[PDB]
Design a protein around this ligand. Structure first.
Ligand SMILES: Cc1ncc(C[n+]2csc(CCOP(=O)(O)OP(=O)(O)O)c2C)c(N)n1
Ligand SMILES: Cc1ncc(C[n+]2csc(CCOP(=O)(O)OP(=O)(O)O)c2C)c(N)n1
Ligand SMILES: [Ca+2]
Ligand SMILES: [Ca+2]
Ligand SMILES: [Mg+2]
Ligand SMILES: [Mg+2]
Lengths: 814, 810
């Protein structure tokens, strides 16, 4: 008998959610339809009837709890202790407060659909309970003494969230009201009703691409946490900035970025101490039914990927919704892990102004047509339960009418109205840091020569690309800058060149040489820090995270590195919707750096190109800086200029692979100490040697590693009639420097743009059209030397690659 | 109290025994790890506990209590909680012969060639007898084919020891081999059945092939009349998908693809997943690659059973592979096998993996391979004699010599028009409702207007599309059309499926064209679905479907072309380049709603400039038709041309309801696709081509606005020529048309898109070089260059649009 009871307890805890009354529409009738002497028997010693009543109340009323999939027993125990108790009914005051939030939420919706045209698509009607729910989340975060709640959400109810959650005045929200308002960021202050705390509340900008903002929000919150010295990189472990992420049911189940972002939730490089997720589950996706949208019971099942607790709650019960919101915040604070709230509700209107939703979902909309709103339902229920008197209900309807008038009236009143050069001692310090190992640290035998070579380079020169990068980042840290660098295998470097983190051969302990530069020789901190991580195997979420990190902390140097530039197309949505366009669309600024290894080396179409042509196509005046440096010193100056220029603008860098180890691609100490970034470079024989520019009749214009091959062919054949000029900064085109450089070769009769990439790729598609237009006296007659146009970045054969490369060199010198 | 502790103990093993199972061959985590003769309800507690420890805490970690279906939990419980009969000596020797072949292959690959370390299967060889068991069990069920998708690790070993490709084929001109497709036949060793085994092509982008494989299998399943769109529920084409641990946890496409597993439009009857879990991703440790216990935790999204298996136990690995196939057959749902193993070598030739993972590699350095381990284990247990072990080693040696010798020996050596009757039949089909069907009051006028357009003309875009698809079905073609809200259409224009107002039953008017008037089938079919809210998986699936059935007409529709960038990896790695890279052909159609209408930067552009940039001769067809009839002929040409080539179409939004954008019946019955269109006043009216001094070249809906301005101002001096086919550029038709306007003094390319977008970036550079006698001096009229596809303000949009029209006629 006691064995059947234990199995019955487990059955309610595991599967009671399959029988909970969570759907306000009750669309599926089969949901519910599909001994007595044992009830008074005692089984802590409690009667079976009391055990069963606690289980039905906790798991089979208006909240479906999914938590037995959680692997941590202490988390399962924490939930079952809070859920399996006799809960004290809310005070009438708390019920009246929740009703006032529904009053404000519904008053906003009535106004939005009555005053303006084309607002049906944004309607929160049938889902208004999300407002007292969000209110409870933020109020509970303030109760925990947290610093800020950052929200990311799509368009549904966004202006309602601005007014009733962020607390933006109507004068600001409806100022010159057309749709861009549905994409902009916002900031406000939430002041507790029944408490004495306040908390900052912000909303991040986003495109119409559903869920694409998810990893952006995480990076933004992480940057804010790092600044407050809270969380993973902080002294305190309160993670005092809370991500509050809203979603729609169809998008949450279908978009891959959701799983990529959930995958970041506990990573040392990306954790934000747990995100509070709210899915506005109106059980429809435009005209699409959930059966065509997902292959699982709930739209939230993806959250089981990280063992997150899931609460399915009935949107027509705002008390249960507010209670679950507060429980979610307490779980997040206790375990620093994500909590998912699935609010079952409905979409009162069609998807947009034209849509009659009974055309495609007649059964659902015949049931929706019998529904009174959550506010009228909650007021009527409170009257029935004997919770409020007829007078108190009339006062509630008066408060609703007052809110409605206030928004109409207020909107009516609104209608009436630099050097980057460092001293040599900085280079020496960064070099010495590579040999300043912790006491008893055991360096891997193959890493030790790298550390010694770096000390040698810092004092004697011949500085390679990999060290030049760390000299730039280390000098920024010494000057007080926060530097965050990440990507796939970025700590060591894909080409075993970086070693930003070195690993103890015996203990596995990590040592970060550049972190020593965060402390001055006197011992005081510089205010700077080096944060370097290996990312998860993701492009979409990792790029979105780094973009959001730079938005969150504009003073940080933020770099994301692709394993090979060819994989960055996995993050195309972030490049198109945020990086390249966020500034022009929303006035949102980012200084994020994307490092994209690029170059034709015969390793195939997925290990050759960062798609220079695509980034040049996205570019417009002042949107991004695009570069392909050919020397370590120039890369050093490019990064230091980027971090010190006081301009928040993304930087795209096409970085080398084999050129990392090209013995000709090295720089002198004086290039770091007495020079600056050069958008255009000339051959050293003309700037520092005995070369004669006046002998040149053929000018080769190029970018990147092909320069060294062209220079080696020029040297082999003693071709004084040919000069090679490098365009280091591809965008904005350095018009003036390019004009000035070309003027010093007066006997040029022919000019060629030379590139490794196919004719429909690389810089030619844009340069071939732009250069003869911006500089007609220099580039009229400009011809191309490249690989033939191809549907792939390169051939799949290393043999075909070598022949094509030799054809380019032979044509250039033909 | 005693019995109560026993039930709680049974539940703990079933729920959490996998946390204590000896699954890791390396045993990296050390922290991982009397009353018993009393009978319980009748078995002794010691025998109850032994069954539980063997089932859940030995070399297999079973995760199944998260499954919501109780019959699935029961089915697993019953097969895993039994005293299992030890495999026959013939089976153990067979598993060892597969490990022998697998290891001999690896020794050869790493000894003969340079640069093969990155693809080494050393430490993970047990995946070969595991895959062998999967395919053998599929053959035992009498299934038709197993289609594999995998990344590069052990790919050539799979070709030789699974697909059964000869060494002469594998090492011919020997890295493109690591990406190509392959087909073979698997013949059972101890059975009398055979099964086809194929491998699909893939880029280096890990997991990107996942939805491609599902689409390819579904196309094959539809062809064999099996599964969702078939007579039997066998789903006799099985997807076998391999993965790496870091990519399976980090790539979003995995979740998007798992999300398709039970959908009516995308289900393949369950996929068998094998994760080669070597507990590393290049230099990255699992604690930096995922936020959960297992790399396979994403599979809990669809309640899939998960089996964590020790790669050093090939018997347990082969047993789990067979159980997985039985589960898939019983429940038509995905099964995930997490094979714990190790990566013996560095990620590549340069890598000393102890630089970044010294503890793991000091433990790997003590490991003998799973072959030497399994041979020694078979001697110790007394399952094979010393002689049989020597023969087993003689078999390895013999397999090694054979591959060296065979590769050594290798080194030495049409009209698209339809008739009036066809148009009328498609119009009439819209009114041929099933008995007792109740049409929605707002859908009924659409059905009656279509009958009216079929007989009287003024055919709009939406009907012209269905006229093209419907006529192809009547001719016997399989038409598969899908995308977000595609059944109704995003702009409420398609109504390819209509819903009974009273019962909710779906009716597909075009499906009536799959049956001849005599009652016999045409062989054609209309498969139309609302997709999940995915771009990456949905586009990958449709691409895969076109590969799987080259005779099918496959169309994927973006809600707005602006969202197709979510599928950029599929566009770049498969659609635009699969033919040139792997010789893999696809006739997939992408329909991208496009046009400047003031709805913002995410509801304006399908990024024409990006598709034109990807294009190279013979890779794709790119079009932006301006008339319903020209769109009809474009789709008909595409489906009937006998060429497998992707088609990119920039489709209208407001132009769907533009009263001037309608076609006559004669445009369907007596014309063809026109790559270049002239104004009807010159081809059919009283317009004089010799009066023209200014030529406006354009594409798409802006034509109607330019024509309206011409008509308002009676501008006989200006002509508007449309480029309907943007790629390949219709060079001969363009020259021929322009030669008909001899007094042209100036030419302009006119477009709605910003100067750095639309067709201008490519046309501005390409038109003066391919046709210098016509386009030298070509000038642009467009929106200014922008970092976004458009302004976010409808007011700015209107001003800019008027500026374009005023410049064109200035
Ligand atoms: C990435 C992306 N794909 C497609 C769309 C087009 N779209 C807009 S709303 C919608 C349906 C959304 O359903 P759901 O996520 O349940 O949200 P709801 O509108 O019901 O609140 C789609 C497909 C989009 N905005 N973003
Ligand atoms: C989409 C994508 N991103 C990045 C890479 C680069 N890459 C190649 S192998 C590797 C690590 C793979 O780890 P895992 O998935 O565990 O497979 P394994 O090599 O261990 O078999 C990465 C990140 C890739 N090929 N594809
Ligand atoms: Ca800057
Ligand atoms: Ca074709
Ligand atoms: Mg929805
Ligand atoms: Mg791995």
């Amino acid at each position: 008998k006691n064995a059947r009871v234990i199995e019955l307890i487990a059955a309610y805890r595991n599967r009671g959610h399959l029988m909970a009354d969570i759907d306000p529409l009750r669309l599926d009738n089969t949901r519910f339809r599909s001994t007595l002497w044992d009830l008074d028997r005692e089984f802590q010693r409690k009667k079976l009837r009391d055990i069963l009543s606690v289980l039905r109340d906790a798991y089979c009323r208006h909240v479906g709890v999914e938590y037995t999939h959680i692997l941590e027993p202490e988390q399962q125990r924490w939930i079952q202790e809070r859920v399996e108790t006799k809960h004290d009914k809310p005070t009438v005051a708390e019920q009246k407060y929740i009703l006032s939030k529904l009053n404000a939420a519904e008053a906003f919706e009535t106004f939005l659909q009555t005053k303006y045209v084309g607002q049906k698509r944004f309607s929160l009607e049938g889902a208004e309970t999300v407002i007292p729910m969000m209110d409870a989340v933020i109020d509970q975060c303030a109760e925990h003494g947290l610093d800020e709640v950052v929200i990311a959400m799509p368009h549904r109810g966004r202006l309602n969230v601005l007014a009733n959650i962020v607390g933006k005045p109507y004068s600001q929200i409806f100022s010159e009201f057309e749709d861009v308002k549905y994409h902009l960021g916002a900031t406000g202050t939430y002041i507790q009703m029944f408490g004495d705390n306040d908390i900052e509340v912000s909303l991040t900008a986003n495109p119409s691409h559903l869920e694409a903002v998810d990893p952006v929000l995480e990076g933004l919150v992480r940057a804010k946490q790092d600044l407050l010295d809270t969380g993973e990189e902080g002294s305190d472990n309160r993670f005092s900035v809370v991500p509050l992420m809203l979603h729609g049911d169809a998008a949450f189940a279908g978009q891959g970025v959701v799983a990529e972002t959930l995958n970041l939730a506990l990573l040392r490089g990306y954790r934000t101490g747990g995100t509070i997720h709210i899915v506005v589950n109106n059980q429809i996706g435009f005209t699409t039914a959930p059966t065509d949208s997902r292959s699982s019971e709930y739209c939230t099942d993806v959250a089981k990927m990280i063992g997150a607790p899931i609460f399915h709650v009935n949107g027509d019960d705002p008390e249960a919704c507010a209670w679950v919101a507060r429980l979610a915040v307490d779980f997040r604070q206790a375990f620093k892990k994500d909590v998912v709230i699935d609010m079952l509700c409905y979409r009162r209107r069609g998807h947009n102004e034209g849509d009659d939703p009974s055309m495609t979902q007649p059964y659902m909309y015949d049931v929706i047509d019998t529904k009174r709103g959550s506010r009228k339902a909650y007021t009527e229920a409170l009257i029935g339960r004997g919770d409020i008197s007829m007078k108190e209900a009339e006062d509630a309807l008066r408060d609703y009418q007052g809110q409605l008038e206030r928004v109409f009236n207020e909107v009516r009143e609104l209608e009436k109205h630099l050097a980057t050069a460092v001293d040599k001692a900085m280079l020496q310090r960064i070099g010495d840091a590579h040999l300043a190992l912790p006491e008893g640290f055991t360096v891997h035998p193959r890493v030790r020569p790298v550390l010694e070579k770096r000390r040698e380079m810092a004092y004697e020169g011949r500085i390679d690309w990999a060290f030049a990068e760390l000299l730039a980042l280390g000098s920024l840290i010494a000057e007080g800058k926060l530097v965050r660098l990440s990507g796939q295998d970025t700590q060591r470097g894909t080409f075993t060149q970086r070693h930003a983190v070195i690993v103890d051969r015996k203990t596995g302990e990590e040592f970060t040489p550049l972190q020593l530069l965060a402390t001055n020789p006197d011992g005081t901190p510089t205010g700077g820090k080096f944060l370097v991580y290996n990312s998860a195997l993701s492009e979409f979420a990792a790029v979105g995270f780094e973009y959001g990190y730079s938005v969150g902390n504009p003073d940080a140097m933020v770099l994301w590195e692709a394993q090979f530039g060819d994989f960055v197309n996995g993050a195309q949505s972030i490049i198109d919707e945020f990086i390249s366009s966020g500034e022009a669309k929303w006035g949102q600024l980012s200084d994020v750096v994307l490092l994209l290894p690029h170059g034709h080396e015969g390793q195939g179409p997925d290990h050759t190109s960062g798609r220079i042509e695509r980034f040049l196509q996205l570019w417009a005046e002042g949107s991004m800086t695009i570069a392909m440096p050919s020397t370590p010193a120039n890369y050093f100056h490019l990064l230091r200029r980027h971090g010190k220029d006081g301009i928040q603008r993304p930087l795209i860098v096409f970085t080398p692979k084999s050129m990392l180890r090209n013995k000709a691609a090295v720089s002198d100490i004086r290039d770091f100490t007495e020079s600056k970034f050069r958008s255009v470079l000339e051959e050293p024989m003309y700037t520092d040697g005995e070369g004669d520019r006046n002998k040149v009749t053929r000018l080769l214009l190029t970018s990147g590693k092909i320069y060294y091959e062209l220079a080696a062919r020029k040297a082999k054949e003693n071709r004084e009639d040919v000069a090679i000029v490098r365009i280091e900064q591809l965008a904005p085109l350095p018009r003036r420097r390019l004009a000035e450089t070309l003027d010093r070769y007066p006997n040029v009769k022919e000019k060629f743009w030379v590139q490794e990439e196919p004719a429909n790729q690389g810089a030619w598609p844009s340069f071939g059209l732009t250069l003869p237009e911006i500089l007609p006296d220099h580039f009229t007659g400009l011809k191309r030397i490249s690989r033939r146009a191809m549907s792939a970045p390169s051939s799949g054969s290393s043999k075909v690659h070598a022949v094509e490369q030799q054809e380019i060199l032979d044509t250039a010198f033909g």
